[PDB]
Amino acid sequence: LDPQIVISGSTAAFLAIGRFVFLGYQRREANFATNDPAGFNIIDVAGWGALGHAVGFAVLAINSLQG
Amino acid sequence: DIAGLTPCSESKAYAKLEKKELKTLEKRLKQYEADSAPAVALKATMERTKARFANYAKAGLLCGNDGLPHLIADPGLALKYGHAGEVFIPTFGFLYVAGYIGYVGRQYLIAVKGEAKPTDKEIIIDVPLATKLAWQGAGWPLAAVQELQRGTLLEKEENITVSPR
Amino acid sequence: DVMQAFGTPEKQILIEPVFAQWIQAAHGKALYGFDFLLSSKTSAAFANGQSLWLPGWLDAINNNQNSLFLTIGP
Amino acid sequence: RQSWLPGSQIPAHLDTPAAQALAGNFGFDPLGLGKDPVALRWYQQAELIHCRTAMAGVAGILIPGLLTKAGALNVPEWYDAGKVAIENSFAPWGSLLAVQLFLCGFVEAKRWQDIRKPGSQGEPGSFLGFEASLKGTSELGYPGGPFDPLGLSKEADKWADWKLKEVKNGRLAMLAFLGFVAQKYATGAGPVDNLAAHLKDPWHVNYATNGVSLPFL
Amino acid sequence: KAGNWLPGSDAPAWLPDDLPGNYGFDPLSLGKEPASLKRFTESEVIHGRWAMLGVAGSLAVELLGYGNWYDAPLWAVNGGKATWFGIEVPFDLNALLAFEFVAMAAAEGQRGDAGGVVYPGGAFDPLGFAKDSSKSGELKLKEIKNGRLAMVAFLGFVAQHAATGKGPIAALGEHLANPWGANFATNGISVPFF
Amino acid sequence: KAGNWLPGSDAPAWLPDDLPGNYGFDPLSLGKEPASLKRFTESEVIHGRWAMLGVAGSLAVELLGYGNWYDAPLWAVNGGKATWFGIEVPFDLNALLAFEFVAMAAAEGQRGDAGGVVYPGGAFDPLGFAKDSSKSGELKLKEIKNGRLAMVAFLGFVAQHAATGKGPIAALGEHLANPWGANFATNGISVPFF
Amino acid sequence: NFGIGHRMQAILEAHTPPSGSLGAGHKGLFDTVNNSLHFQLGLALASVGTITSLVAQHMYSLPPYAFQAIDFTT
Numbered sequence: 001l002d003p004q005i006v007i008s009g010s011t012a013a014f015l016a017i018g019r020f021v022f023l024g025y026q027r028r029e030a031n032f033a034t035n036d037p038a039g040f041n042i043i044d045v046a047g048w049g050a051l052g053h054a055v056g057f058a059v060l061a062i063n064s065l066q067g
Numbered sequence: 068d069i070a071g072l073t074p075c076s077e078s079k080a081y082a083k084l085e086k087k088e089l090k091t092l093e094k095r096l097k098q099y100e101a102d103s104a105p106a107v108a109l110k111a112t113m114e115r116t117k118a119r120f121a122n123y124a125k126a127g128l129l130c131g132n133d134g135l136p137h138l139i140a141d142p143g144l145a146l147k148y149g150h151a152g153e154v155f156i157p158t159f160g161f162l163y164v165a166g167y168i169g170y171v172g173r174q175y176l177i178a179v180k181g182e183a184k185p186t187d188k189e190i191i192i193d194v195p196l197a198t199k200l201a202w203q204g205a206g207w208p209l210a211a212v213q214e215l216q217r218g219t220l221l222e223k224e225e226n227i228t229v230s231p232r
Numbered sequence: 233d234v235m236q237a238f239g240t241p242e243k244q245i246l247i248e249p250v251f252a253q254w255i256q257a258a259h260g261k262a263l264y265g266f267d268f269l270l271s272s273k274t275s276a277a278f279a280n281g282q283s284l285w286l287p288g289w290l291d292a293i294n295n296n297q298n299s300l301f302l303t304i305g306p
Numbered sequence: 307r308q309s310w311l312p313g314s315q316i317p318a319h320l321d322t323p324a325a326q327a328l329a330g331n332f333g334f335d336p337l338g339l340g341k342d343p344v345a346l347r348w349y350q351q352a353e354l355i356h357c358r359t360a361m362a363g364v365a366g367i368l369i370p371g372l373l374t375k376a377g378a379l380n381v382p383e384w385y386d387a388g389k390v391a392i393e394n395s396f397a398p399w400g401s402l403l404a405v406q407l408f409l410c411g412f413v414e415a416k417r418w419q420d421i422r423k424p425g426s427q428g429e430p431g432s433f434l435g436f437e438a439s440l441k442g443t444s445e446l447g448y449p450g451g452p453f454d455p456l457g458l459s460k461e462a463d464k465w466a467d468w469k470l471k472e473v474k475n476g477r478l479a480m481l482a483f484l485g486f487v488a489q490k491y492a493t494g495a496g497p498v499d500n501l502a503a504h505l506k507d508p509w510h511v512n513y514a515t516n517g518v519s520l521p522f523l
Numbered sequence: 524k525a526g527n528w529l530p531g532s533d534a535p536a537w538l539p540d541d542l543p544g545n546y547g548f549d550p551l552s553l554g555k556e557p558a559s560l561k562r563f564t565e566s567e568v569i570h571g572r573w574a575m576l577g578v579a580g581s582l583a584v585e586l587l588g589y590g591n592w593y594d595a596p597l598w599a600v601n602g603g604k605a606t607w608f609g610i611e612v613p614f615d616l617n618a619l620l621a622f623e624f625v626a627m628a629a630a631e632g633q634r635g636d637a638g639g640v641v642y643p644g645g646a647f648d649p650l651g652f653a654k655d656s657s658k659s660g661e662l663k664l665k666e667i668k669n670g671r672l673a674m675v676a677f678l679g680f681v682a683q684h685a686a687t688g689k690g691p692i693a694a695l696g697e698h699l700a701n702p703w704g705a706n707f708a709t710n711g712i713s714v715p716f717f
Numbered sequence: 718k719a720g721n722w723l724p725g726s727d728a729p730a731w732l733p734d735d736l737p738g739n740y741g742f743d744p745l746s747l748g749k750e751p752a753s754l755k756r757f758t759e760s761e762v763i764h765g766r767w768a769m770l771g772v773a774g775s776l777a778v779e780l781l782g783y784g785n786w787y788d789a790p791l792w793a794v795n796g797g798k799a800t801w802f803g804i805e806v807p808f809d810l811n812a813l814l815a816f817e818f819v820a821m822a823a824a825e826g827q828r829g830d831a832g833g834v835v836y837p838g839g840a841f842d843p844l845g846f847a848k849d850s851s852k853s854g855e856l857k858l859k860e861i862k863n864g865r866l867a868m869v870a871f872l873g874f875v876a877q878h879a880a881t882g883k884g885p886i887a888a889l890g891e892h893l894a895n896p897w898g899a900n901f902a903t904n905g906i907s908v909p910f911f
Numbered sequence: 912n913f914g915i916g917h918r919m920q921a922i923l924e925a926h927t928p929p930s931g932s933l934g935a936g937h938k939g940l941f942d943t944v945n946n947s948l949h950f951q952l953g954l955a956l957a958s959v960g961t962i963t964s965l966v967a968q969h970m971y972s973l974p975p976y977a978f979q980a981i982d983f984t985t
């Protein structure tokens with residue numbers, strides 16, 4: 001597992017799922033101006049981006065344990 | 068067997084305890100003449116001791132390292148390993164007797180409540196009625212289920228007093 | 233107390249703490265012979281943690297000189 | 307009114323016309339178990355099933371036993387027959403009991419639902435056309451229909467007598483089974499031996515001389 | 524109503540007769556509230572559809588001689604390689620987990636927003652079976668009944684494996700070979716005292 | 718009424734006079750409900766038609782020295798191959814089971830969906846025969862009587878084999894050889910004791 | 912302050928069993944807890960007190976400090 005590849009891919013995946021899948025649900029649950037059409041503000045990026053980093057490091061961490 | 072315990076029948080500590088107990092009784096039986104009433108009494112206690120150690124072992128009781136019988140209370144272990152006369156069966160025996168007392172007493176209170184002076188029937192016991200209920204209490208378990216199913220066992224909350232809250 | 237006073241300690245009620253001993257067995261203690269979970273070397277819970285903490289834990293929980301899950305009785 | 311105890315006070319719940327319509331009503335309920343009508347109905351069903359099971363079982367212990375005593379049969383004693391039968395069976399006892407509970411539970415559930423609501427098992431379209439026959443009669447515990455192949459229940463001038471013989475023979479067979487259990491534990495022999503032994507010396511061979519029934523005398 | 528689960532019993536009032544697969548079975552009255560029933564109706568259909576795929580897959584793998592549903596993922600904990608209909612799969616657990624998570628997150632997410640839509644149709648009904656209403660009732664009943672049977676089968680697959688350690692087809696083989704000697708009552712686990 | 722099964726008995730009113738094979742025999746009152754009688758009527762004809770083919774082929778095989786009905790499937794249980802009229806048939810049990818299941822489910826499904834049609838026509842009635850009702854009635858009585866006879870015959874074959882373990886023709890030979898020595902009462906099974 | 916996160920009042924208000932087994936559920940509890948220092952102190956004491964007993968049970972069974980288990984008095 002290439003550290004740069006795992007994390008990079010992980011962050012992108014969460015940013016995508018949070019921008020095209022759960023954005024509506026989160027907004028509905030929610031009941032920083034962004035020119036993004038779907039209104040994806042920076043704080044939203046920070047959140048999903050963080051999730052991605054965590055998941056990425058987890059994969060690398062367990063992989064480093066070799067199994 | 069269970070919990071690392073050992074049958075009293077195969078415990079060495081169980082055997083040593085029985086010898087220790089009989090040796091105390093024997094050290095005392097000496098100071099008395101053979102037919103003396105004291106001697107007869109110490110002998111009957113020695114016989115009762117021998118029967119107890121034998122009866123307990125035959126019942127298949129398990130003994131700890133202390134050489135003393137331990138009781139198995141898990142329904143699963145007791146039934147699968149022959150230890151149900153230790154806690155399980157006793158439980159249903161007591162529950163029957165205790166419910167018997169409770170159901171009869173409840174039946175008495177209900178009967179005297181419809182009288183002129185219930186308080187008087189609580190200080191002076193209506194013996195005939197009490198004896199009748201005492202005999203009819205043998206079938207309490209079925210009566211208690213039949214009352215539970217008719218909804219006559221409990222009282223409506225609307226009729227029970229409570230504090231302001 | 234009465235059974236001890238009348239010199240009949242074999243007549244005392246001594247209920248074994250089987251439910252607690254079963255938990256201790258589950259945690260690894262084999263003194264009770266329940267053989268399950270961490271007390272069973274063929275259990276998955278045993279195999280999964282064999283390369284992690286179990287080894288050190290099992291050595292300690294099976295040592296009767298520390299205070300880790302002391303032996304219990306009536 | 308026939309009484310289990312001449313001169314005793316019959317419970318009013320057993321003197322009610324519906325209770326008197328019940329077969330075997332000799333006014334016997336000293337513990338007052340059937341005071342509640344709804345319970346009396348469940349207990350009447352329970353007594354009928356116990357009577358019909360005990361009659362079948364006791365017939366399956368005495369009849370084979372007498373025939374074996376004669377020679378016409380070589381059946382083992384009732385208390386040893388399970389081991390003998392399972393010894394050469396196609397299935398272990400556990401598998402045989404599992405199949406028993408499935409088949410008994412099904413027919414017991416249908417009978418149960420018929421007690422909860424009589425005639426319910428005739429629910430149209432519930433049993434491939436057999437539900438029509440699964441409806442019992444106007445009397446609970448007396449299904450008739452396929453259960454009365456010879457139509458003896460159709461003779462109203464003989465109905466009461468037939469039900470009284472069933473209840474009295476059933477109550478006797480229930481006590482005969484309890485006797486078979488008690489005598490087995492007190493003798494170590496079978497019911498046919500116990501009978502022959504007593505008949506040989508009735509004054510010295512009885513429960514008073516068994517060394518168990520009367521531990522005081 | 525599809526029928527009665529307990530002949531001669533009264534069907535609960537909360538269960539609509541139009542509800543596909545109504546046999547009056549709600550003894551716990553879990554569906555006595557309408558909103559709870561609406562979720563339970565979508566979840567039964569969803570569970571049934573997964574179960575049917577699962578049981579079909581569980582049977583196929585063994586019937587095609589590729590092992591049983593239980594030993595399928597061992598290659599990951601055995602340091603091997605993925606295999607499908609024999610073909611070796613180039614991805615590994617890490618890749619499988621990622622692809623799936625993204626795929627399932629997208630699909631389920633899309634379905635969740637659509638609401639309780641149980642029968643989507645359109646792109647999901649290409650051959651146009653449930654276009655009308657007359658065919659619908661029976662086809663939805665067949666779907667709910669086959670889903671209920673598959674859910675029970677899968678449960679059976681797990682329970683039987685846990686007690687015997689054999690695959691469904693291998694267990695059928697033993698039961699057919701010795702019906703009275705090879706069943707749950709002979710396992711030594713289902714009934715402890717049997 | 719084709720007759721009275723029990724002379725001196727009155728026929729159950731629920732049994733229609735035209736009902737083919739109406740000998741007034743419903744002692745347990747099973748056909749009392751019209752719906753039930755309808756299903757039982759169709760089932761009785763189906764049972765008779767199947768049995769009339771079973772008895773035929775059960776006697777034919779033995780008469781043609783190809784074995785008895787009971788030993789016909791043992792080839793599958795052993796390593797033996799399948800034969801028919803001596804000619805060998807190349808199929809394992811599994812193939813036969815699947816082929817029959819699909820074939821039966823198909824034809825039986827069409828019959829079932831039809832709606833209890835006991836007497837179809839055209840393909841099932843070439844060679845005319847049932848075009849005139851006058852002939853139809855007697856022909857329907859002959860079918861039910863021959864079918865009922867064949868149903869009692871098959872049960873006899875199964876019972877005889879269960880008590881003697883021999884083929885139906887082989888029994889007929891044993892009985893004809895010694896009628897008073899070879900009969901149900903001389904098998905040690907039908908009549909106890911002796 | 913950033914548009915993301917949970918509103919405790921919304922969480923509590925949503926936790927109401929649909930069958931009415933808990934009445935209005937946790938409705939009004941946000942304000943009940945937020946406006947009652949005694950309610951807040953009751954929870955803190957109940958939690959800290961249970962945690963204090965855990966410290967006692969875990970420190971003796973799993974001694975975290977070197978040469979602590981040999982110091983019986985300590």
Ligand code: CLA
Nearest residue numbers: 141142143144145146147148250251252253254255712715
């Ligand atoms: C009330 C508290 C209590 C507690 C703490 C236990 C604890 C225990 N029971 Mg149990 N039991 C209880 C009440 C309790 N029982 C009651 C009221 C009954 C009457 C029905 C039983 C009937 C019972 C049976 C029949 C069995 C146990 C058994 C056991 C032991 C293992 C059971 C298990 O896996 O989880 C704990 C169990 C419970 C929390 C509740 C009941 C026990 C379940 C229902 C039995 C399932 C056991 C299962 C087969 C696991 C063991 C596998 C194998 C060794 C048999 C365990 C130490 C098993 C055993 O060890 O037998 C040798 C056994 O088979 N119990």
Ligand code: CLA
Nearest residue numbers: 168169170171172173174175176192193196197198200201
């Ligand atoms: C008809 C008699 C009777 C009955 C049916 C009950 C029933 C009950 N009592 Mg109770 N009680 C009784 C008498 C009775 N009590 C008396 C006389 C006292 C004064 C000591 C109490 C004091 C008492 C307390 C303090 C408590 C109960 C509680 C309870 C409930 C819990 C179970 C329990 O028994 O706990 C145990 C009850 C006892 C140990 C009291 C023993 C009373 C004796 C054994 C009963 C004898 C009654 C009478 C002499 C018999 C008359 C017979 C008649 C023919 C003349 C239960 C419903 C507990 C409860 O509320 O739980 C919800 C509870 O805390 N009771």
Ligand code: CLA
Nearest residue numbers: 737738739740741742743747748757758760761764865868
């Ligand atoms: C599955 C086979 C079958 C079925 C469905 C029927 C159905 C029917 N028969 Mg029939 N019958 C049969 C076999 C069958 N029969 C055989 C083999 C014989 C030759 C002995 C006869 C002789 C016969 C006569 C003489 C008459 C009927 C009549 C009838 C009709 C009257 C309604 C009725 O009796 O209730 C419904 C019937 C059933 C539900 C049969 C189902 C099978 C039973 C109920 C299950 C258990 C049977 C049990 C094992 C006993 C079997 C015999 C035993 C030795 C094994 C009915 C539609 C009467 C009629 O009017 O016909 C037009 C009538 O006159 N049958």
Ligand SMILES: CC1=C[C@H](O)CC(C)(C)[C@H]1/C=C/C(C)=C/C=C/C(C)=C/C=C/C=C(C)/C=C/C=C(C)/C=C/C1=C(C)C[C@H](O)CC1(C)C
Nearest residue numbers: 335336337338339356359360363366384387480481483484
């Ligand atoms: C009424 C009254 C009222 C008031 O109030 C009170 C009082 C008095 C309480 C009451 C009384 C009561 C009584 C008396 C009761 C009794 C009961 C019984 C005995 C039952 C049995 C019951 C019994 C029964 C069922 C039985 C059954 C049996 C059977 C199945 C059999 C089986 C078998 C056989 C064949 C043989 C083999 O080899 C074995 C076996 C397996 C064993």
Ligand SMILES: CC1=C[C@H](O)CC(C)(C)[C@H]1/C=C/C(C)=C/C=C/C(C)=C/C=C/C=C(C)/C=C/C=C(C)/C=C/C1=C(C)C[C@H](O)CC1(C)C
Nearest residue numbers: 549550551552570573574577580581592595674675677678
């Ligand atoms: C209704 C009611 C009401 C009343 O009131 C009461 C009561 C009774 C409570 C109730 C009932 C309930 C019930 C019965 C339930 C059941 C459930 C189930 C069984 C499910 C399953 C469920 C199941 C399911 C889904 C399944 C799934 C599966 C899947 C996806 C897949 C899988 C797989 C495969 C392919 C193969 C591989 O190699 C492996 C795997 C990966 C493993």
Ligand SMILES: CC1=C[C@H](O)CC(C)(C)[C@H]1/C=C/C(C)=C/C=C/C(C)=C/C=C/C=C(C)/C=C/C=C(C)/C=C/C1=C(C)C[C@H](O)CC1(C)C
Nearest residue numbers: 575578579647648649650651669672673676679691694695
């Ligand atoms: C929507 C759409 C649209 C368009 O337009 C059209 C189309 C395309 C047509 C459609 C689609 C559809 C689909 C996909 C379907 C699927 C289905 C399935 C798979 C089912 C299963 C289904 C399945 C099922 C039921 C299952 C069943 C099972 C069972 C019973 C089991 C049995 C058993 C057990 C337990 C165990 C043992 O050991 C063995 C055995 C014996 C084996």
Ligand SMILES: CC1=C[C@H](O)CC(C)(C)[C@H]1/C=C/C(C)=C/C=C\C(C)=C\C=C\C=C(C)\C=C\C=C(C)\C=C\C1=C(C)C[C@H](O)CC1(C)C
Nearest residue numbers: 743744745746747764767768771774786789868869871872
């Ligand atoms: C009506 C009535 C009414 C009133 O109510 C009363 C009562 C009496 C209840 C009733 C009655 C009923 C009855 C009697 C029934 C009977 C009988 C029978 C036998 C049936 C069968 C029936 C039978 C049948 C179908 C059969 C069939 C058969 C088949 C297909 C086939 C076979 C075979 C062959 C070819 C050859 C090979 O190698 C093998 C096999 C494959 C094996």
Ligand SMILES: CC1=C(/C=C/C(C)=C/C=C/C(C)=C/C=C\C=C(C)\C=C\C=C(C)\C=C\C2=C(C)C[C@@H](O)CC2(C)C)C(C)(C)CCC1
Nearest residue numbers: 140141142154155158165166167168169170173207211212
């Ligand atoms: C009928 C009767 C009475 C009783 C009245 C009432 C309402 C009693 C209430 C009972 C209630 C509400 C019980 C509620 C829950 C009880 C539960 C959950 C049962 C717990 C028992 C367990 C877990 C069994 C434990 C074990 C078993 C198998 C037996 C032993 O082996 C010991 C042990 C612990 C291992 C009246 C009036 C007091 C008067 C009198 C007679």
Ligand SMILES: CC1=C(/C=C/C(C)=C/C=C/C(C)=C/C=C/C=C(C)/C=C/C=C(C)/C=C/C2=C(C)CCCC2(C)C)C(C)(C)CCC1
Nearest residue numbers: 011015036045046047048049050051052053054055057058
């Ligand atoms: C705008 C736009 C776009 C896009 C762009 C981009 C590219 C974005 C991205 C951005 C990004 C790039 C994001 C990211 C984020 C991330 C983050 C925010 C992270 C964080 C981290 C964390 C939180 C961690 C933590 C921790 C540590 C520290 C230690 C260990 C453990 C852990 C890991 C947990 C497009 C073209 C589409 C369209 C148009 C416009």
